Amino acid sequence: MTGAVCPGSFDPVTLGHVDIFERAAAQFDEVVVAILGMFDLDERIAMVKESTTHLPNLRVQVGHGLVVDFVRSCGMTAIVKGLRTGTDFEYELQMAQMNKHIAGVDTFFVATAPRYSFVSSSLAKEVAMLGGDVSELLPEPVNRRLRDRLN
Amino acid sequence: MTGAVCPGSFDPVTLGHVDIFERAAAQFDEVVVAILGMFDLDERIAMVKESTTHLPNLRVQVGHGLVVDFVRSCGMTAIVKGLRTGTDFEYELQMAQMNKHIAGVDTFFVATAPRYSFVSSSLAKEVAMLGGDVSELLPEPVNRRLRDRLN
Amino acid sequence: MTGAVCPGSFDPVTLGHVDIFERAAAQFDEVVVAILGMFDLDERIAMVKESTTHLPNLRVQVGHGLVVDFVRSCGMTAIVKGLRTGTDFEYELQMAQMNKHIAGVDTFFVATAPRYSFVSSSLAKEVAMLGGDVSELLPEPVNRRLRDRLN
Amino acid sequence: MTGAVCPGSFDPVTLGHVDIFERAAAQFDEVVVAILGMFDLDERIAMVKESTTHLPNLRVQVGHGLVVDFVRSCGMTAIVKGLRTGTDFEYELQMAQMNKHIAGVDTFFVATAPRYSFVSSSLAKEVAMLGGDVSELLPEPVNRRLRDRLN
Amino acid sequence: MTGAVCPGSFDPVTLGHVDIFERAAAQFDEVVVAILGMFDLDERIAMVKESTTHLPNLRVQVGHGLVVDFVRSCGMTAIVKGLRTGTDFEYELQMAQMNKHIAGVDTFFVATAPRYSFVSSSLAKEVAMLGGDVSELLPEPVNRRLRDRLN
Amino acid sequence: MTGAVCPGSFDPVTLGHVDIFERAAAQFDEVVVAILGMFDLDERIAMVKESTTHLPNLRVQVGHGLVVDFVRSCGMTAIVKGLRTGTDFEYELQMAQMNKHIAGVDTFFVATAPRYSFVSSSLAKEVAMLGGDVSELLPEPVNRRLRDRLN
Ligand SMILES: O=C(O)c1cnn(-c2ccccc2)c1OCCCc1c[nH]c2ccccc12
Ligand SMILES: O=C(O)c1cnn(-c2ccccc2)c1OCCCc1c[nH]c2ccccc12
Ligand SMILES: O=C(O)c1cnn(-c2ccccc2)c1OCCCc1c[nH]c2ccccc12
Ligand SMILES: O=C(O)c1cnn(-c2ccccc2)c1OCCCc1c[nH]c2ccccc12
Ligand SMILES: O=C(O)c1cnn(-c2ccccc2)c1OCCCc1c[nH]c2ccccc12
Ligand SMILES: O=C(O)c1cnn(-c2ccccc2)c1OCCCc1c[nH]c2ccccc12
């Protein structure tokens, strides 16, 4: 049995994140989205859940402390995340090698879909709160809350 | 059922490659090493086989044409390869997105072990043929053939 | 009066190139595509011409020697090209600074459209000639010739 | 009619910035320097104005909110900025593609002059306030204020 | 007579730092570790001293202000530091060229040992304080204090 | 006693190379320029010699095989080279770590002078042979031979 943990702050979750969730869900038996700010923990969870109803083998859970302890305790087998740029890679390479060193846990990376390469939660927030239309970059459950939260 | 294809020229296979094979073999049901020069096809195959006897769910096969056609025809589910540097990533990102575009096939990357980050088949060859000791960087089945081939 | 030269081998021209042509044509009075292999010079020209009929202020011309001499002789005012990655940038930065040094000619770069970030003429060719469908990445005038050329 | 907006914090403006202003002013009908800390808004403006008296088609203006809204409202046609490194490019590539997505506004980049590649406002400030001579990196109107401000 | 200054915050010093100290000590007559937070200045000094007893030509000293003023005042001849990634290089390249500009002081870089490429003081701290075993990445004098400090 | 070897093809030597020679010569007792095409070996040597008459502790020598064997045999203590970009660094990092692995020989890097960051022997040649004035980028002994060689 295999299991991928996808860790992050998801504040908020983007269509880029969901694309990675979908791609991890097709290769692993279970996916756990581990949520480690604009939105509360509770809202971040609902946003992820409402955006992933089409993924029966995925669940969302709050995480505390080292991602590797989360992986080992819950019997998962790998960490999975997306990479957009060579700069993403150098940063994530450090964390992955450190995680391999301390716990023997492997990290698998997948390349962003080209259409979401420029998306970050932080940029989407900064733009959305200034009137920019980032609706095509985020799941509708997130768009709802941004519209409300900003009215 | 899941399956990872690890494609490359493997001329020759290195301990870095084997590390990736091992890590793919722990997450996927089968691994196929697809061999796409210093050594003949036949020798490259034996070198890979002799270096992976400890991996029962791995097999070696010659590949022709697009890696994605190999993946789809044989019912495999993903391409897996290692990345050493941000420059590896930018090059492999192009191929991965192109492969996703033409065939819907996903590529999962894993970070090199730190001790092999500077290893390439080409550099190992150029150095070995000049008297440099690269034996700690390559499997013993490869070292044997380099010693012979160079006597 | 302003003029941008867009230099390259265009073997063949891609939808990524055309996107840059369009964006240069909106800021400059004239655009000259300077064509500096799979296709003949004559075919490369027709492919560019047939792909740019919607750009009245753009023309195609064969180029020989330094791009800066082409710019100065024909009274153009800048070189314009696209960038996909940080690695594109470092290479093109060298040429741009050298061109500024020898001739005082400035180069303006524009970021690729995200959907074409992984496109190169060379990769498109290698894939197309192996049966891969790259038709969505190239103008129809190019697709025609690839289909013919490969039948 | 064409117009380039050059946005930034300009705290303070450097000779690198001025070089880009000059190069934008030669290709566009108007340039607007949009000023979006060590110096007040008022001082930043004077410093830019006093450093650009030789550019009749350039004006300085305070900016609020999205740069793209500034461009569209004032009938400008492009954003123009400098790039020093591949790392500058990856960061600015994200903003440029986001700006293209939300507003259709294009960004043109120009490579730094080699002599200013290591210049940043932040590094110049940190060094100047410690006695280092950064006078050759900044316009005299800025040097005046640094000398005063630091006496 | 030659002298290398190795500047940094060393909070705490790592085995990666010590490797660089050793390599600088073999090429220069003297090495000065200049200490410019988790640990006090006093503790940082002891940790460096206790970790370098095997280097008779190395001494540790607190630094204030520009590293170049430290180098010139004490008659040293160069700054020496390690680089892990291309991103380290671009950042350190800026500081090195600025230091050359203001004071004529040269900086020599050495590549990290592969086994420490993923090590940073900040990552080691964050992990150690969460129960992760980073003991193989740090000198025993540092490990002692982390164990104490965290009991 | 210390000694730096500066290895390369020097076809031809540039002002960027000479800047590095000068900076190595100020920190090491001897510098050996090891010459490992447009110009003959004999001419490359004369060009380097004529360009370095102001460096009494520098000599030029032809090199064969591994640079590390050259260093060890002649009792030198380090390899020294310049770096222009993060991409230079990633490539040279591989060679440096391989050289450390096989022979224990360390490599020290120095950052290019900003004014020569875009200079390469290959680009200078391609441009010079097309009429471009690269004379300010190369030593006069090289300029002489390019003028002759191209008349
Ligand atoms: O960094 C962000 O805020 C942010 C928001 N969306 N995307 C994204 C954009 C395009 C594609 C995939 C995501 C981002 O890029 C960071 C990717 C790093 C990452 C960390 N944890 C993850 C878990 C799942 C997937 C990715 C990650
Ligand atoms: O490029 C090479 O010649 C070469 C030789 N060994 N290693 C290596 C060094 C360290 C770690 C993993 C490999 C290399 O790096 C390239 C990694 C790209 C790659 C392409 N196909 C693959 C299949 C399996 C694993 C990796 C790849
Ligand atoms: O390098 C290639 O073969 C190739 C084919 N298509 N694209 C592309 C992909 C996405 C976006 C814009 C182009 C490529 O990327 C290289 C971009 C460098 C460039 C040089 N000359 C140019 C003239 C106009 C536009 C770009 C360039
Ligand atoms: O980042 C800085 O503080 C800073 C100060 N000077 N220079 C500079 C150094 C060399 C060359 C051109 C500028 C900097 O580099 C950042 C370049 C990004 C940029 C953003 N907005 C701009 C508007 C006009 C021009 C550039 C920019
Ligand atoms: O950045 C850190 O916190 C940190 C902790 N250990 N290492 C390291 C990891 C591997 C190898 C050499 C160091 C780090 O990498 C930063 C290297 C930059 C550097 C600045 N000053 C220095 C003085 C001596 C040596 C290096 C530096
Ligand atoms: O690569 C080239 O052809 C080339 C020509 N000049 N410069 C240069 C440009 C700016 C600054 C220092 C050199 C080049 O950059 C490559 C630098 C790599 C290098 C290898 N061996 C060396 C020996 C001494 C110094 C450098 C090197």
Q: Are strands D107-111 and F30-35 parallel, antiparallel or unpaired?
A: unpaired
The conformation of residue C138, written as its DSSP 8-state character, comes to S
Q: Is B110 annotated as a binding residue?
A: no
Where are the extended beta strands (E) located within C9-149?
A: 30-35, 58-62, 78-83, 107-111
Distance D99 CA to ligand 1 centre (A): 19
For residue B44, the one-letter residue type is R
Torsion sign, CA atoms F97, F98, F102, F107: negative
Q: Are F112 and C88 in contact (CB under 8 A)?
A: no
Closest CA of chain D from A76, distance in Å: 33
Which DSSP helix (H) or strand (E) runs through E89?
A: helix E86-103
Binding-site annotation, residues of D for substrate:
9, 67, 81
Where are the extended beta strands (E) located within E53-97?
A: 58-62, 78-83
Pocket residue to mutate for ligand 6, from F9, F20, F58, F94, most atoms within 8 A of Cβ: F20
The reply to whether F137 touches chain C by the CB within 8 Å rule is: yes
Q: How far is CA E133 from the centre of its chain?
A: 22
Q: Is F10 exposed, middle or buried (0-12, 13-18, 19+ CB in 10 A)?
A: buried
Q: Are C109 and D110 in contact (CB under 8 A)?
A: yes
Q: Are F103 and F71 in contact (CB under 8 A)?
A: yes
Q: Are E23 and E110 in contact (CB under 8 A)?
A: yes
Q: How many CA atoms, within 13 angstroms, populate the side-chain half-sphere of residue E100? A: 20
Beta carbons of D100 and C86 less than 8 Å apart: no
Order of strands, sheet of F58-62, starting from the edge strand that comes earlier in the sequence: E58-62, E30-35, E3-8, E78-83, E107-111, F107-111, F78-83, F3-8, F30-35, F58-62
Torsion sign, CA atoms D37, D41, D43, D45: positive
Helix (H, G, I), strand (E, B) or coil at F7: strand
- CB of E84 within 6 A of ligand 5: the answer is yes
Rounded Cα distance, D24 and D55, in Å: 10
DSSP string of B12-69, one letter each residue = T--HHHHHHHHHHHTTSSEEEEEE---S-HHHHHHHHHHH-TT-TTEEEEE--S-HHH
Residue entry with tokens 């640094």: D146
CB atoms within 10 A of CB A99: 22
Rounded Cα distance, B76 and B40, in Å: 26
How was it solved? X-ray
Q: Are strands B3-8 and B78-83 parallel, antiparallel or unpaired?
A: parallel
Q: Are D90 and D62 in contact (CB under 8 A)?
A: no
Residue entry with tokens 């790392």: D87
Rounded Cα distance, B56 and B128, in Å: 30
HEC string of chain A?
CCEEEEEECCCCCCHHHHHHHHHHHCCCCEEEEEECCCCCHHHHHHHHHHHCCCCCCEEEEECCCCHHHHHHHCCCCEEEEEECCHHHHHHHHHHHHHHHHHHCCCEEEEECCHHHCCCCHHHHHHHHCCCCCCHHHCCHHHHHHHHHHCC
Distances (CA, A) of E45 to E7, E51, E75, E143: 13, 10, 22, 15
Rounded to 10 degrees, the C-alpha dihedral F132/F133/F136/F140 comes to 110
State both tokens at A66.
């080292």
Q: Is C51 annotated as a binding residue?
A: no
Q: Which residues, judged by CB distance below 6 Å to any ligand atom, belong to the binding site of ligand 6?
A: F 6-8, 14, 16-17, 20, 81-82, 84, 112, 116, 119-122
Q: Are strands A78-83 and A107-111 parallel, antiparallel or unpaired?
A: parallel
Helix runs in F8-149, H state only: 15-25, 41-51, 67-73, 86-103, 121-128, 140-149
B61: which strand partners? Answer: B34
Q: How many CA atoms, within 13 angstroms, populate the side-chain half-sphere of residue E99? A: 26
- For C98-114, letters b (16+ CB in 10 Å) and e give bbbbbbebbbbbbbbbb
Helix (H, G, I), strand (E, B) or coil at F80: strand
Measure CA of the first residue to CA of the last residue in chain D; give whole Å: 46
Q: Which residues have a Cβ under 8 Å from the Cβ of C49 and sit 6 or more positions away?
A: C60
For residue E45, the one-letter residue type is I
F residues 80..109 contacting D (CB < 8 A): 85-87
Q: Is the peptide bond before D141 cis (omega within 30 degrees of 0)?
A: no
Measure CA of the first residue to CA of the last residue in chain F; give whole Å: 46
The conformation of residue B138, written as its DSSP 8-state character, comes to S
Where are the extended beta strands (E) located within C86-127?
A: 107-111
The reply to whether B123 touches chain F by the CB within 8 Å rule is: yes
- The ligand 1 atom at the shortest distance from the C-alpha of residue A11 is 3
Helix (H, G, I), strand (E, B) or coil at D57: coil
Q: What is the resolution of this structure in A?
A: 1.8
- CB of C96 within 6 A of ligand 3: the answer is no
Distance C21 CA to ligand 3 centre (A): 10
Residue of F nearest to D113 (CA): F115
State both tokens at A122.
């932080």
Helix (H, G, I), strand (E, B) or coil at E72: helix
Report the residue from E86, E114, E118 with minimal CB separation from B118.
Answer: E114
Helix runs in chain D, H state only: 15-25, 41-51, 67-73, 86-103, 121-128, 140-149
State both tokens at C144.
């025609």
Q: Which residues have a Cβ under 8 Å from the Cβ of D122 and sit 6 or more positions away?
A: none
Q: Is C91 exposed, middle or buried (0-12, 13-18, 19+ CB in 10 A)?
A: middle
Torsion sign, CA atoms E56, E62, E68, E70: negative
Q: Please state which of the four CATH numbers 3.40.50.620, 2.60.120.10, 3.40.140.10, 3.40.50.300 is assigned to the domain occupying D1-151.
A: 3.40.50.620
State both tokens at D44.
């930043």
